[PDB]
Amino acid sequence: TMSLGAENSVAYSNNSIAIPTNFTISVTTEILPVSMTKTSVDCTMYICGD
Amino acid sequence: CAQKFKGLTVLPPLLTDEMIAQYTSALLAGTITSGWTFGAGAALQIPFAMQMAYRFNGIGVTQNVLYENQKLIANQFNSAIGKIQDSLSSTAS
Amino acid sequence: FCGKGYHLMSFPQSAPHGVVFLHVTYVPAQEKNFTTAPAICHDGKAHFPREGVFVSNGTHWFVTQRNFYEPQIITTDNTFVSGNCDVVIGIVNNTVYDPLQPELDS
Numbered sequence: 001t002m003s004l005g006a007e008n009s010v011a012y013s014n015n016s017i018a019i020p021t022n023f024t025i026s027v028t029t030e031i032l033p034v035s036m037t038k039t040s041v042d043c044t045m046y047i048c049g050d
Numbered sequence: 051c052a053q054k055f056k057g058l059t060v061l062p063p064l065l066t067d068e069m070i071a072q073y074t075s076a077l078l079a080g081t082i083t084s085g086w087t088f089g090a091g092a093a094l095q096i097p098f099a100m101q102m103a104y105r106f107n108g109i110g111v112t113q114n115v116l117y118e119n120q121k122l123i124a125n126q127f128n129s130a131i132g133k134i135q136d137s138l139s140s141t142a143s
Numbered sequence: 144f145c146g147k148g149y150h151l152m153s154f155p156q157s158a159p160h161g162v163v164f165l166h167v168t169y170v171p172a173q174e175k176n177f178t179t180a181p182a183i184c185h186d187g188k189a190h191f192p193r194e195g196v197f198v199s200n201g202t203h204w205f206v207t208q209r210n211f212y213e214p215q216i217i218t219t220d221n222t223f224v225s226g227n228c229d230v231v232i233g234i235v236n237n238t239v240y241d242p243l244q245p246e247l248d249s
């Protein structure tokens with residue numbers, strides 16, 4: 001059976017807050033199609049040639 | 051049963067109805083206990099009143115308004131949530 | 144939308160029958176426990192931060208930005224006054240330093 005992910009629990013409280021003290025720079029890619037191949041068909045020859 | 055035969059079948063979905071509920075519950079818990087920080091990295095806890103005050107500050111209203119009308123806002127939210135059940139339970143789906 | 148995290152900038156690249164993006168993002172790390180309060184009462188008045196949060200180093204109190212740990216002394220230029228000290232739930236007694244009267248008293 002597939003696993004959804006790792007279990008976690010946030011330490012919520014009446015008066016508690018967390019502030020980061022350091023940062024990381026991340027670079028990610030992303031691929032998107034734009035165009036495909038252009039084609040043309042000769043119907044008269046394809047239906048019956050010669 | 052369910053028409054069947056003649057080579058017409060129905061394939062069950064990959065994700066059952068329990069995994070989706072687990073995902074939605076996790077999302078709700080994260081939104082409640084972290085705000086919007088869990089969508090960009092590690093989840094950071096913060097009191098709910100402060101998160102709502104910052105959300106008010108994000109739309110051009112100073113944060114003291116919530117700290118003065120917290121009870122009224124909570125009552126309005128509770129009543130609005132309560133009305134949704136009656137709205138959905140009606141036959142006019 | 145433009146990458147995962149806080150977007151900074153992007154650079155395009157060409158691919159056959161397509162296009163490739165490179166997203167630069169800002170990701171926080173290394174959080175720490177802290178104690179927070181919604182408001183601070185000094186002289187029967189409620190003080191709220193301008194663009195920060197209230198943090199406590201166990202004993203003292205500071206104000207810092209929400210995305211980076213940078214403590215500062217709570218002054219009258221960091222907070223604004225509105226109301227009294229009997230309507231906000233969770234208010235904490237403290238002192239606010241005035242950066243004008245004590246030194247520039249001449």
Ligand SMILES: *[C@@H]1O[C@H](CO)[C@@H](O[C@@H]2O[C@H](CO)[C@@H](O[C@@H]3O[C@H](CO)[C@@H](O)[C@H](O)[C@@H]3O)[C@H](O)[C@H]2NC(C)=O)[C@H](O)[C@H]1NC(C)=O
Nearest residue numbers: 020021022023024025026170171172173174175211212213
């Ligand atoms: C914030 O995080 C950065 C990393 O993203 C920290 O920089 C890294 O600091 C460690 C030590 O704390 C460096 O490791 C050691 O560096 C010395 C000096 O070059 C080297 O001789 C050792 O062999 C070891 O590698 C690490 O190199 C350094 N990373 C970079 C890219 O410079 C930074 O210290 C953190 N700042 C705070 C305030 O936590």
Ligand SMILES: *[C@@H]1O[C@H](CO)[C@@H](O[C@@H]2O[C@H](CO)[C@@H](O)[C@H](O)[C@H]2NC(C)=O)[C@H](O)[C@H]1NC(C)=O
Nearest residue numbers: 198199200201202203204205206214215216217
């Ligand atoms: C939390 O931060 C305060 C602010 O510096 C620390 O205060 C100490 O006491 C006085 C305040 O200026 C200084 O003479 C000490 O040098 C401070 N200690 C430092 C800077 O390490 C306080 O010690 C910090 N920790 C706790 C648990 O309160």
Ligand SMILES: *[C@@H]1O[C@H](CO)[C@@H](O[C@@H]2O[C@H](CO)[C@@H](O)[C@H](O)[C@H]2NC(C)=O)[C@H](O)[C@H]1NC(C)=O
Nearest residue numbers: 183184185186187188228229233234235236237
């Ligand atoms: C914060 O300061 C206020 C005002 O100084 C305190 O309110 C006083 O509380 C005492 C009891 O400890 C009463 O006898 C006084 O009548 C209150 N008012 C004044 C003007 O002194 C308050 O107790 C302090 N602490 C907190 C947590 O609010």
Ligand SMILES: *[C@@H]1O[C@H](CO)[C@@H](O)[C@H](O)[C@H]1NC(C)=O
Nearest residue numbers: 011012013014015097232233
């Ligand atoms: C937070 O404070 C409220 C009001 O004092 C209290 O009812 C609640 O139990 C507290 N939550 C805790 C201590 O986890």
Ligand SMILES: *[C@@H]1O[C@H](CO)[C@@H](O)[C@H](O)[C@H]1NC(C)=O
Nearest residue numbers: 010011016018174175176177
């Ligand atoms: C903050 O402290 C509590 C109890 O002292 C602890 O359970 C929690 O893990 C701490 N936070 C972090 C980020 O470690």
